[PDB]
Ligand binder design. Structure first.
Ligand SMILES: *[C@@H]1O[C@H](CO)[C@@H](O)[C@H](O)[C@H]1NC(C)=O
Ligand SMILES: *[C@@H]1O[C@H](CO)[C@@H](O)[C@H](O)[C@H]1NC(C)=O
Ligand SMILES: *[C@@H]1O[C@H](CO)[C@@H](O)[C@H](O)[C@H]1NC(C)=O
Ligand SMILES: *[C@@H]1O[C@H](CO)[C@@H](O)[C@H](O)[C@H]1NC(C)=O
Ligand SMILES: [Cl-]
Ligand SMILES: [Cl-]
Lengths: 529, 532
């Protein structure tokens, strides 16, 4: 049968599903690992033992145990990112959408959800892969991985909680694709991994890791890069946060073994309840348990790997959204609200930059402040608001990504950069938030093609060209089918705008601010902090 | 006789001179101190001992011994600033222009020339005071003071070379005015001191120094203020440069006494030929012998006095020119030429910032560079030229002055700020230089009123309103003539921070003169360099 597939670990039965007055095959909740429960908590994933009989793959799997956002109850803007299935530690599964009829060795795209490494689910409505797999004729896979302490508690030296297991979960799903995608009509040789934010940073990390390099052909990074300030920690910081987590739960701290044993006895929700208490500063856009630079998954520091060219050489397509920081200001900075224009006073501004650049000393805060304040109108609440918004986005997403793109292009085989700046006409968030972090996703997945979602015809057109750019790039390493999307080069540094208007080519995306964040501030902090 | 005046030191005989179809009385080269020669070189000035007979005051006196610029031989643009009279150490004289018929108790304005404290002369053509004295009916006085090592060699502790003697020369000229100006029809109670650049810094220093405060009513500072990075040095730096001077002349450096004695036996030109070698680093807009914070002429640090309000509280009128730094880039930075557009390559821009900010460490240099570079277009030679121009002007003149104006206004009794940005039609310098340092002076002195000079009619009008603002301010403490139809120059207040543009176009009021850059220069950079 078309829905009955035999994989190297057993048989699986999919389901024919509707998609734009038609149908395609979908295999939901396929296990690619053994359930990480009990003694398995905090440990590297183990290949899923082969089962007999037919695995029912007609419904979405559980979502991993995670912090759940309750800020705005009932609000669709925030609720659309929360788990839409039961949460469980038994969550390592993948989903696959296959064109119907089943293609012959077609391009494979593997989605990696974001969520700051503390959240995310593969089953969200916006991650439904039926529109993209169908419209672009590609086999679309969405994997999952452990988040929060469950996937990143790091006690370097130990083998019970080595850290980065969430990345290893991802790597194993990729290994599973490499080994089984051919039975679904996919070409294990032409696999493209792509993800947004933590997903984008994850993609970048696999590009840098020797152990992941041969598990994919090309990469797409959306609003995230491996070198982001919030994307990783040192082994030492990882350890203190782990110890602090144990302290918060009255754990025995005499040894890694005792701490770990103690933590394995706690119910998932107990860990999660205190997760945020281990952060070293009052801050925004900073998450507790993230990847650690251990010398194993990552040979050396991320920077040295970028400089020496020690990473996978291939084609990459990446970009950022216009207003990456608004979401985090709304949730953690004083003066911001979802129901007002959020004019920011001078005082709140100062509090805001402190929260945005937690690691900075006073001279560093003055530099940031000076770089983003218009002293001919320092009491303009709109400028103060937009100024803060730029600080968070530049420092956390845009500039770290530009640093990555420039380093990568020295050795890469092709870079395509984009700047997504279209504010969806049906957004439920306030205007001041602008082009929000993560909202380019619905366009990549083709949600504007379903009429009941009330998108405009130009938005549906944009989505189609984005999907086509993404899929064409995945198939050939070039988003253009022989308005050309310029190749980003060390010399020209061209990039395109991604919106409803005709394609425009620009150069040096926010170069002034990125010189500040990538070269000046770091130098100032190393010489005075 | 209108030309025969008897002063507290003896009789003086002036001369009648032509001025715009009329006539005015002038007393040139009136001595106000004893000749600072021989054993008196480096010493505080001493009152001119009384003379008998009539002192012929019909010609300009000698100019003090100073470095002479020979960069462009024959070029009027630079030569107009060089000594136009023989140089001598015997140079403490003043000049006076008195309206005819002689006023009864009229306003007095005392000019203090600039020249980085290493040059200047009260006898230049641009300082001819007959036009302003005649046009605004004021008694105009131009004084002089020792410059270079002669006026600022400083060996703290010593009484032979105390330092700041050039500032003391100025004070003595002021004391002379206070005691004798009434004999020329001037009011000792209503004297206004004004000077440009080093002269501007001097004016602000007399406002700061307790011993100078009672010698004048108010002040005008043009393109210069006391807190400028080049206007003063610490006792230590002063001593180091004095010793380094002797070293350059193979002097006995065992004691200030011998060092001084050695230096006193050298010919003037000998000291001048080595003057520049004592500077700490390669730089632009830095001069060897300038005032020193001695705890005497200046009770404490300039910054502390400004914060405490420890200074003369009165009315001040001050301002700057749009392109203060071009002159100095031309003379000492690579890539600049008076015969080309002077487009600067990124390489020379970098060299330029180091020269311009000599005391800054690498981190400081990077902050300056980032602050004045448009990274979307870093090879645009024009943007680099203008960026460097702005750096020099902002660091050395504009921002130090804004710092001063804001501090002073917290305690002052009225502040008026201007931004001079008119490029003279007959300027011999290249256009890239814009509104050059010191070229607002010719407007202040009414040169545009003399037709053979070929200024435009609009420039004559600008000069007349500038002279009127200046004189009306000196007379009343307000540049504006009460209830008049003409636009009004608003008071600069700590809150609104208003100022006006001074050019041939109708007045425009603005706020926060270059706040962005001055926040960087006055607050951020100092903290960055102080860090470590
Ligand atoms: C798979 O499980 C779902 C229940 O979640 C059920 O409705 C469906 O019939 C099952 N498929 C088969 C044939 O077992
Ligand atoms: C990619 O590699 C091929 C093969 O060496 C080379 O010819 C091509 O120029 C490269 N493309 C880029 C943009 O680096
Ligand atoms: C004063 O000096 C001038 C300049 O030489 C001369 O013309 C004039 O006759 C002199 N007056 C007397 C009384 O000597
Ligand atoms: C100057 O001082 C007088 C009284 O001494 C005061 O009335 C006046 O308001 C002051 N002027 C300004 C502008 O500060
Ligand atoms: Cl549908
Ligand atoms: Cl004349």
């Amino acid at each position: 049968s078309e829905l009955l597939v035999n994989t190297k670990s057993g048989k699986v039965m999919g389901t024919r599903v509707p998609v734009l007055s038609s149908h395609i095959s979908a295999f939901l909740g396929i296990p690619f690992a053994e359930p990480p429960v009990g003694n398995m908590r905090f440990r590297r994933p183990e290949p899923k033992k082969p089962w007999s009989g037919v695995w029912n793959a007609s419904t979405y799997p559980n979502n991993c145990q995670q912090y759940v956002d309750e800020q705005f109850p009932g609000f669709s803007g925030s609720e659309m990112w929360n788990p839409n299935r039961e949460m469980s530690e038994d969550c390592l599964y993948l989903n696959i959408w296959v064109p119907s009829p089943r293609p012959k060795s077609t391009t494979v795209m593997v989605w990696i959800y974001g969520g700051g490494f503390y959240s995310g689910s593969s089953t969200l409505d916006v991650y439904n892969g039926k529109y993209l797999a169908y419209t672009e004729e590609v086999v679309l896979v969405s994997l999952s991985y452990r988040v929060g302490a469950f996937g990143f508690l790091a006690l370097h030296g130990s083998q019970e909680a080595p850290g980065n297991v969430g990345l290893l979960d991802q790597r194993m799903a990729l290994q599973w694709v490499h080994d089984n995608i051919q039975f679904f009509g996919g070409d294990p040789k032409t696999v493209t991994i792509f993800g947004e934010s933590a997903g984008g940073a994850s993609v970048g990390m696999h590009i840098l890791s020797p152990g992941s390099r041969d598990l994919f052909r090309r990469a797409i990074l959306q609003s995230g890069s491996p070198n982001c300030p919030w994307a990783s920690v040192s082994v030492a910081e990882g350890r203190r946060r782990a110890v602090e987590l144990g302290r918060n739960l009255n754990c025995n701290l005499n040894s890694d073994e005792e701490l770990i044993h103690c933590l394995r006895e706690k119910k998932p929700q107990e860990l999660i309840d205190v997760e945020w208490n281990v952060l070293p500063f009052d801050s925004i856009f900073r998450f507790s348990f993230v990847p650690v630079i251990d010398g194993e998954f990552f040979p050396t520091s991320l920077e040295s790997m970028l400089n020496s060219g020690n990473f996978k050489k291939t084609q990459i397509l990446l970009g950022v959204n216009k207003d990456e920081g608004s979401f985090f200001l709304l949730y953690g900075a004083p003066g911001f609200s979802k129901d007002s224009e959020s004019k920011i006073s001078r005082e709140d501004f100062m509090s805001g930059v402190k929260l945005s650049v937690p690691h900075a000393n006073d001279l560093g805060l003055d530099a940031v402040t000076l770089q983003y304040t218009d002293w001919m109108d320092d009491n303009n609440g709109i400028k103060n608001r937009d100024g803060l918004d730029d600080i968070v986005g530049d420092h956390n997403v845009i500039c770290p990504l530009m640093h990555f793109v420039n380093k990568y292009t020295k050795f890469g085989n092709g870079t395509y950069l984009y700047f997504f700046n279209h504010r969806a006409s049906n957004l439920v968030w306030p205007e001041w938030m602008g082009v929000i972090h993560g909202y380019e996703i619905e366009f990549v997945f083709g949600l504007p093609l379903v009429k009941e979602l009330n998108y405009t015809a130009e938005e549906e057109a944009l989505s189609r060209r984005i999907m086509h750019y993404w899929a064409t790039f995945a198939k050939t390493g070039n988003p253009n089918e022989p308005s050309k999307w310029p190749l980003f080069t060390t010399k020209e540094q061209k990039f395109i705008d991604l919106n409803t208007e005709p394609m425009k080519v620009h150069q040096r995306l926010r170069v002034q601010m990125c010189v500040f964040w990538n070269q000046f501030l770091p130098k100032l902090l190393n010489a005075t902090a």
